[PDB]
Structure formats: structure tokens, C-alpha cells
Design a protein around this ligand. Sequence first.
Ligand SMILES: CSC[C@H]1O[C@@H](n2cnc3c(N)ncnc32)[C@H](O)[C@@H]1O
Ligand SMILES: CSC[C@H]1O[C@@H](n2cnc3c(N)ncnc32)[C@H](O)[C@@H]1O
Lengths: 230, 234
Amino acid sequence: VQKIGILGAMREEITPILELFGVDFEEIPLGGNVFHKGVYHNKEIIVAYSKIGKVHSTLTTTSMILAFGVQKVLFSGVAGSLVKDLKINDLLVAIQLVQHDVDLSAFDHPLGFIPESAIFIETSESLNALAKEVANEQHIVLKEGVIASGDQFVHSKERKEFLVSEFKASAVEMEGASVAFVCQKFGVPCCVLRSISNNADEEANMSFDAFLEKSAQTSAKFLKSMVDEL
Amino acid sequence: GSHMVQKIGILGAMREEITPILELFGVDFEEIPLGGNVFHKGVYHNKEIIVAYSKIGKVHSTLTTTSMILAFGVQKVLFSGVAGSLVKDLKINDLLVAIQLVQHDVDLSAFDHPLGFIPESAIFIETSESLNALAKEVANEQHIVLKEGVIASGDQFVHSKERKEFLVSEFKASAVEMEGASVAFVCQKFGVPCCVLRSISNNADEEANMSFDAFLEKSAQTSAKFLKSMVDEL
Ligand SMILES: CSC[C@H]1O[C@@H](n2cnc3c(N)ncnc32)[C@H](O)[C@@H]1O
Ligand SMILES: CSC[C@H]1O[C@@H](n2cnc3c(N)ncnc32)[C@H](O)[C@@H]1O
């Protein structure tokens, strides 16, 4: 039987996913997270929000894999735009992710890099193609790009520019790279989707609040459409 | 069940921090690969010991600790390795036990959260009072000086006056490193007692890279020797 993990960082990112799938869920508490286990179209789905940031999201991903045996992980949630052509409510699949706050430059390493790892983490080529196929099939605009993930909420042009020049990222968030990383370590196909809710600038906290619902819904509905195709 | 053979997890971040541990215990270890890590499993004084280095940084250490707990059933986690000093009385080679830890690079202040704070969590993470007390007893017994304090963890190697100043100011931390808070965090989430031990290898300032390289093996040995002394009492 197929087992799919479905992740958000915040409760508001998973509420619409629980509603849209519509089925009964069993709540299973583990490691401070609540996993919702259900059956949908023959597939077992396990849904949780990690809580914000890289440690919470690493922990939740690793639990989904080791404790619930998921064979794929789909992540949905909101992000800040780093570049002028990514506008509020746009949807983006991350083709590669980076931990933008990693700095071992004292030992001559480039920013983002840790020994025994890589700067850019890859997501699943087959699931990214599925995302593209579903967006096409539905006439949805789906952007692709690099997402930078770090443990700060980015709200300044100074940091925005650094992210774009250093890592060529298009959007910034606090969980994608860690979720993708954990899945690579365990050989689990991963897809990370984000909807834009802010421009990661002085006004980002206001915009984040005004568009959280609409942006979380946009990302949630697309994830469901992918699962309908798996 | 607490009546079963006890399983202890012992963690470092780099291979050099666990090489002396495997040697000090001196028993046969089976190597088990999982999640990009190698776990070394042995039996020592009628307890099962599971030893691994996570690789550097918060993501690597969160994943490895979650594996030790979930895949290996550890019931206590002890962490040993090296750290940078933030205070004058913590000198190269000195031992520190972390009473609390903080993720010093967490910043959601755009929403007026205090630095280090994440919604639905807390700034400071606690470790095991009983294990910390055993460390203090073991230090006394073995004659070693053992400092107690706050450890700040983040995903940057700190090597500046200005960053050390901020860590002292904001968090009153005594040392800095890249894994402790994430290990203690995962342990607290699963209800597993955790002790974080560090030996100083550098002063977290402009020459920190050179001092780190010079003292990695010696400081890792000091921390490993102390961790073994702890296990010999459990
Ligand atoms: C309340 S902290 C921000 C949350 O939304 C995502 N996010 C949205 N916009 C941004 C931004 N500008 N910088 C960092 N994270 C963001 C993050 O992944 C985190 O879960
Ligand atoms: C090589 S990156 C530094 C490694 O040693 C620890 N460490 C020692 N000194 C420091 C320092 N000054 N800043 C950050 N981490 C340090 C960290 O936990 C990490 O595994």
C-alpha cells in the first residue's frame, strides 16, 4: 500500500489540507507533533505541521519517515518573494534548496556548505515533473526556482539581495531545505511547494498576516491535485 | 520498560569526537548505517551503547538524534565534543556542562518575538538535572574542574569579537557550538534525558579557526574521557 507524508510548518498551512481531503483522520501524537493518519483513494496519508524552523522541520520529517514509513513527502506552505517577478499568491516548486544561514567560511568553505554535504539540495525529478504536468493540465501558473531556507524571517532588502546574489534564490522560507535534506538522507522522494505571501521586505510581517490564509489555501489545493494523480 | 537492558545513545558531531569514545569503551561495535549516519552498537557494563557522529550543524544533529531515539530505542543521550569559549574563565581544554541551551541564530523579531524564540516552543531548552548532577559528582571524584552554564548553538562557526559580544549580551551564554541545542531539543520532545558536555578548543574570536584545528583532537579526548567516566557510573 502507498504511504504519503504531507507536511506544513504551521497549523494554518495544514488545516485546509485536512478539510480538502475530507476523510476521517486518526491523531497520533509523537515527538511533540500531531500526525493525522487517513486513507484517501487507496493511499495512506500522514499529515502534520512541523512548527517553524529547521530543527522542528527536520525532526518532523525524520519522524514521518522512521515512525510512519512514508515513501514520498510532499511539503506545502507559504514563502517570501526575493525577486520582482515572483508576486504575492504565485505558486513555486523548489527545484533546489539551500540552507542560507550556514556559515563555515572561517575554514574556507563557501556560504551554505557543510563538510560531508552540499550547498544545494535536490528534490525529486519525477515529483517535480508531476507538479509541472498537473499545473499544465489545470492551466495554473507554476514557477520553478531555488528556495533559500534559514532560521530567520527575512524582512530587509540587505538580506534579500544577499540571498539572490549568493544562492540565486527566488523565494525564502524556514523549512524547505531541511525537509528536502532529510528525505535525501533516507532516499525518500520529496516535493516542496510554496505560495508567495510577502516580499521579504520592511512590510513582510504585515503582508504575511494579510495573505497567510489565501496563500496557504493556494498551496494546499495544488498539493491535493498532485495526490489525486499519484 | 525501565526494567529492560538500558540503551544509551552517545553522540558527537564530528568523527574526531567519537573516535576516542569507541576506543575508550574498547568493546566490539557493530556498524549500522542509516539516514546517512553510521551507528556503532556495543554492550558495555550490561547496558547497550549506541555511538555516532551526526555531522556538523543543526539539521545534521536533529536528524541523527531523532534516529537514535526512533530507530535505536535509546533511553538517554549523552553528547560530547568541542566548543568555543564566550567567557574569560573558560580556557582551552576546560569542561562545561550545559544547564540550558538556546538556538542563538533564530530571529523572528519581525513579529516582535524575542531573539531565539519560535512560536509553540521556548528560548531555553533544559537538560537532565540528574545527569548534570552525576557530571558534577564525577568531576569532583575525578578531581576535574567542571563549569556549568548556558550553551548557544547555531549554524555559523563563530569567530568574531562582535558575535561573541552579542551572544553574551542576549543569552548570557558561556560557550558556542553548532549542535547542542538541537540535540537537547529533540531529546526534550521525546522525553529522553539528555546531557550536553563540551571541552573548549577555541575562543570564538578572530583566530578561532587556528585554535580549533590545533586543539580538536586534545579537546575531543578530554570530553570523551569525561563522558566515559559518566557512563561508568550509570
Ligand atoms: C512566522 S515565521 C515565517 C513562516 O512562513 C514561512 N515564510 C514566509 N515568508 C517568509 C520570509 N519572508 N522569511 C522567512 N520565512 C518565511 C517560513 O517558512 C515560516 O514557516
Ligand atoms: C568545524 S565547525 C565547528 C564544530 O565544532 C563545534 N564548535 C567549536 N568551536 C566553535 C565555534 N567557535 N563556533 C561554532 N561552533 C563551534 C561545533 O559544534 C561544530 O561541530
